[PDB]
């Protein structure tokens, strides 16, 4: 059971590097205790090896992650970036992706981890909704993450 | 429909590295996981591990974490295991299986599509070719003839060019000490048909080029 | 670790009949995270239903899975020709993945005894200095069979190698094929070759011999 809440979705200011976004939406995670102290090194240094950025078409998105045993309880952070931030494409790919969002996940079971790429394609497939999460505040792009996922939890049954 | 590809038989030395490929000619599998099944003989299923294509995230089971290594490439649609320092314990039939996909492409987690396998051996032997014995007869008469000492797997086995089917029995090869495969096919006729006709056995070992056509008659 | 155990080794049924399978957990399975499949000789292991009850794409009404926690079992309420083969169950509720050991389900018939016929070494083969003698029993069910190789009133062990075919789909028999190994040397030395056979079908241990 994935944990959601308002504190771990933020908007993050300009001006700030990817490094900087990694320890900032695993700082929530470590805090609460849901994560290793120092699992922000161990996503940064598989960031580094594997890149999590996705395209899209409205915006772009990041998939930062580690690997199971780092994670203690499942989690997910959200992250909202004023100006564009230069993500690598993920599966490999020269020219860099423009990620407006980042989506951390921490979860514990590596079976679980397809099951969330595949909410995090059907979120962020719909136009409208990606590029509406840029006005929205943090308790407005909460509650529609939270329902979305709610909505997509009772569809994958 | 999505459908996974595997490389060819593979026979190797101990100590050897081996690399398996797998291809998706369906569809992208970067969504979903891809496992690695293997098979010895005369057991079951066993999960080595799989990996997950986009993030490029592996498992790997706790026996065979050391010795394999699994990735996979998202442009071309292909894994590949790699094992290194092959073992005799290593001969076996190895699998790859995509994850299944529900209703509008939701991951159930378990393995929907599976490749035809790859056989994979083992061996310190060298190709061989087999010798042909006869099983001569002494109503209902059995005769047959035995395919010994060849190396490696597989031998087909027919009788007079296919045109006899019934009664016809071949039995799975059986690993001899020395390291060489030995076979056995026999058929049951009549007796009084035994002085009318010939029953030849067509002995086919494509690893060695050996063809052998047999006469089976009483001793 | 998670282990699973299935239950029984091999489901003897006839067309028609329900079959049930159990398959049991060490520990809980997570969520549910269960499989079984379908794997027939020479073909690629078949997905018929996964997590707890939910079943594949194309798996007729037949099939149904229930279970949860340490306790899953899968039925199959009407038997086909099809349907016979050996069956996995897989958890993937773990950090890993494990199988099961396998239930196999064959078609039942009535016992029948073997044909049981001795095969002496050929001229050619003694030519090359090692003789193998065979002994084949045809057309016997149930599968369990036993051969006792005896060279001269002597009990032979570690020297023989046995081979059993496939269920046939015509007449749900089983064949066996066993091969003994001697050097050209030690085949010259005695006289009497034999190999005894004991089968549900047969009343008394039938045994077939050859002098030479």
């Given amino acids: 059971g994935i944990h959601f809440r308002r504190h771990y979705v933020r908007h993050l200011p300009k001006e700030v590097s990817q490094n900087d976004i990694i320890k900032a939406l695993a700082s929530p995670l470590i805090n609460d205790g849901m994560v290793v102290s120092d699992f922000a090194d161990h996503v940064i240094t598989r960031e580094q090896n594997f890149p999590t950025g996705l395209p899209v078409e409205p915006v772009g998105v990041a998939i930062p992650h580690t690997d199971s045993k780092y994670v203690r309880q499942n989690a997910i952070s959200v992250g909202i970036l004023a100006e564009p931030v230069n993500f690598e494409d993920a599966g490999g790919e020269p020219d860099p992706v423009p990620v407006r969002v980042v989506f951390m996940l921490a979860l514990g079971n590596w079976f679980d981890i397809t099951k969330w790429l595949w909410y995090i394609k059907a979120v962020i497939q719909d136009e409208d909704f990606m590029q509406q999460l840029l006005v929205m505040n943090d308790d407005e792009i909460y509650q529609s993450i939270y329902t979305r996922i709610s909505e997509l939890e009772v569809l994958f049954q | 429909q999505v459908q996974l590809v595997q490389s060819g038989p593979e026979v190797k030395k101990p100590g050897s590295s081996l690399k398996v490929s797998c291809k998706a000619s369906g569809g992208s599998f970067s969504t979903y996981t891809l496992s690695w099944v293997r098979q010895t003989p005369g057991q079951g299923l066993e999960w080595m591990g799989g990996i997950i294509p986009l993030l490029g995230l592996p498992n790997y089971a706790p026996k065979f974490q050391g010795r394999v290594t699994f990735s996979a490439d998202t442009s071309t649609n292909t894994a590949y295991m790699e094992m290194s320092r092959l073992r005799f314990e290593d001969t076996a039939v190895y699998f790859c299986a995509r994850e299944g996909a529900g209703w509008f492409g939701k991951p159930v987690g378990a393995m929907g599509y599976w490749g035809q396998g790859t056989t994979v051996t083992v061996s310190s032997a060298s190709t061989k070719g087999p010798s042909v014995f006869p099983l001569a007869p002494s109503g209902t008469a059995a005769l047959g003839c035995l395919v010994k000492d060849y190396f490696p797997e597989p031998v087909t086995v027919s009788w007079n060019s296919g045109a006899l089917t019934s009664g016809v029995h071949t039995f799975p090869a059986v690993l001899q000490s020395s390291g060489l495969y030995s076979l056995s096919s026999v058929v049951t006729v009549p007796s009084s048909s035994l002085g009318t006709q010939t029953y030849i056995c067509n002995v086919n070992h494509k690893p060695s080029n050996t063809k052998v056509d047999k006469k089976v008659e009483p001793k | ?212």
């Fill in chain 3, 1 to 212: 670790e998670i282990v699973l155990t299935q239950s029984p080794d091999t489901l003897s049924l006839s067309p028609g009949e329900r079959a049930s399978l159990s398959c049991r957990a060490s520990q809980n399975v997570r969520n549910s995270n269960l499989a079984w499949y379908q794997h027939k000789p020479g073909q690629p292991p078949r997905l018929l239903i996964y997590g707890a009850s939910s079943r594949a794409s194309g798996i007729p009404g037949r099939f149904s899975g229930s279970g949860s926690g340490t306790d899953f079992t899968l039925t199959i309420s009407r038997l086909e020709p099809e349907d016979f083969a050996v069956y996995y169950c897989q958890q993937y509720g773990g950090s890993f993945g494990t199988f099961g050991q396998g239930t196999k389900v064959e078609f039942r018939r009535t016992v029948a005894a073997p044909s049981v016929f001795i095969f002496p070494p050929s001229d050619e083969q003694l030519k090359s200095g090692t003789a193998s003698v065979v002994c084949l029993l045809n057309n016997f069910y149930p599968r369990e069979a036993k051969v006792q190789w005896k060279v001269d009133n002597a009990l032979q062990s570690g020297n023989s190698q046995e081979s059993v075919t496939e269920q046939d789909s015509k007449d749900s028999t089983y064949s066996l094929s066993s091969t003994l190994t001697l050097s050209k040397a030690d085949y010259e030395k005695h006289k009497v070759y034999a190999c005894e056979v004991t089968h549900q079908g047969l009343s008394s241990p039938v045994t077939k011999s050859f002098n030479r």
